[PDB]
Design a protein around this ligand. Sequence first.
Ligand SMILES: [Mg+2]
Ligand SMILES: [Mg+2]
Length: 98
Amino acid sequence: QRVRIMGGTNRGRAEVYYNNEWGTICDDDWDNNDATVFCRMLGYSRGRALSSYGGGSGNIWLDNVNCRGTENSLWDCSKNSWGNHNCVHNEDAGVECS
Ligand SMILES: [Mg+2]
Ligand SMILES: [Mg+2]
C-alpha cells in the first residue's frame, strides 16, 4: 500500500502504487478528508485537497475517492474501482500536507 507526493516538498500531486505502476488520482470529489488520509500515510497529520494539480502521466488509478477522513489507509476508503475513471491528467489530484 504505497503512496507518494510528486511536485514540491509539503505539496504535490498525489500518486498511488497499484497494478505494478505508480499512477495518479483523478480529482472528481477529491476533498480534504481524502487529502488528510493520503498525507497521514506519509507521516503528516492532515492535508488540504488540491484540485487539478495536474502533470502526471501513465495510468490514472483512482477516481471519486470518498474517505471519511479517519482511515489509516487510502485502501480502506470508499472509491471507484481501480482504473475506472473518466479523467485526463490535468485533473490529477494533489495535496498540501501539514
Ligand atoms: Mg472531472
Ligand atoms: Mg471525496
